[PDB]
Ligand binder design. Structure first.
Ligand SMILES: NS(=O)(=O)c1ccc(NC(=O)Nc2c(F)c(F)c(F)c(F)c2F)cc1
Ligand SMILES: [Zn+2]
Length: 258
C-alpha cells in the first residue's frame, strides 16, 4: 500500500508516511499575481541547454522522466534567484484527465492542463542524492501547458510514449533538445518550496514561468494513454498525477517582472 494519486493513497494520505507533507515550505502553491512582488534585485535568469545530453525516458509509475547525463556541466540553470550552478538531471510532467486540470501550481486559482518540471541540482553538493538533503539543493523550472496549437518540440516525446506504457519500462532517448519546450519569455515567479511528491523534501527553489506553452489536444491525449500500473497488472490510466496547492505559510512569492 504505497503512495500514489488514488482515493486511498493520494495526496490527502501522504502525511502518514511523510509527515513533512504538512511542513512550512511545501509545494505546489497558488500564485496570487496581485500579491507577488517585483524584486528588482533578481539577476537575469540563464538557461544554458545547448550541450544537453538526453539518455533515456522512464515510466516510473508516477510520471515519465526524460533523463540527462549530469556527470558534467552540460545543461545548466543559473542566475535568477540562484547562487551557483544547477545541473539538469531530468524533466517530467504532471497532467489531468480533462483539459481544465493537471497543473500543480495555479495562477490566481487557475489550473492549466499540465505542468512541465525541469529538475536541476546544485553542483556544490556533488550529487543529486546529497542535494535533496539541502534547503538550496534543487532548482525546478516549472512551465505551464495549455491546450491549443501543437508544440513541435514536444512531439518526439509524445511519439515514444507507446514504448513506455507501463511502470518500469524505459527506452533509449538520445539527442533530445529541451530548448524546444520553452516559451518565448523567461519572466518568472520564484519561492522556496519542496518536491511535490514523496518524499516531499524541502530542498527546492521553484522558478515558475509566467508564459505557458501550447500543446495540442492530440499531444495531451497521448499522455493520458500511459499507465500507472506495470505490465500484466490491471490497467489504470496515468492521469491526474498532480498534487493540489498547499498553504503558503510564511513565504513571499517574488516576480522577476512587473
Ligand atoms: N515534481 S518535482 O517536485 O519536480 C519532483 C522532482 C524529483 C523527485 N524525486 C526524484 O527525482 N528522485 C527521488 C528523490 F528526489 C528523493 F528525494 C527520493 F527519496 C527518491 F527516492 C527519489 F527517487 C520528486 C518530485
Ligand atoms: Zn514534478
Amino acid at each position: 500500500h504505497h503512495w500514489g494519486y488514488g482515493k486511498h493513497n493520494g495526496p490527502e494520505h501522504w502525511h502518514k508516511d511523510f509527515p513533512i507533507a504538512k511542513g512550512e515550505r511545501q509545494s505546489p502553491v497558488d500564485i496570487d499575481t496581485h500579491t507577488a512582488k517585483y524584486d528588482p534585485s533578481l539577476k537575469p535568469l540563464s538557461v544554458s541547454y545547448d550541450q544537453a545530453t538526453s539518455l533515456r525516458i522512464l515510466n516510473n509509475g508516477h510520471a515519465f522522466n526524460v533523463e540527462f547525463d549530469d556527470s558534467q556541466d552540460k545543461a545548466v540553470l543559473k542566475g535568477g534567484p540562484l547562487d551557483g550552478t544547477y545541473r539538469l538531471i531530468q524533466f517530467h510532467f504532471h497532467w489531468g484527465s480533462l483539459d481544465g486540470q493537471g497543473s500543480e501550481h495555479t495562477v490566481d486559482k487557475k489550473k492549466y492542463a499540465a505542468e512541465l518540471h525541469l529538475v536541476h541540482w546544485n553542483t556544490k553538493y556533488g550529487d543529486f542524492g546529497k542535494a535533496v538533503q539541502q534547503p538550496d539543493g534543487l532548482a525546478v523550472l516549472g512551465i505551464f501547458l495549455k491546450v491549443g496549437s501543437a508544440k513541435p518540440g514536444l512531439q518526439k516525446v509524445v511519439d515514444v510514449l507507446d514504448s513506455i506504457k507501463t511502470k518500469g519500462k524505459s527506452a533509449d532517448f538520445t539527442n533530445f533538445d529541451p530548448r524546444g519546450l520553452l516559451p518565448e519569455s523567461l519572466d518568472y515567479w520564484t519561492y522556496p518550496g519542496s518536491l511535490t511528491t514523496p518524499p516531499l523534501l524541502e530542498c527546492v527553489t521553484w522558478i515558475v514561468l509566467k508564459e505557458p506553452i501550447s500543446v495540442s489536444s492530440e499531444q495531451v491525449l497521448k499522455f493520458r494513454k500511459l499507465n500507472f500500473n506495470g505490465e500484466g497488472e490491471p490497467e489504470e490510466l496515468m492521469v491526474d498525477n498532480w498534487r493540489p496547492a498547499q498553504p503558503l505559510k510564511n513565504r513571499q512569492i517574488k516576480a522577476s517582472f512587473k
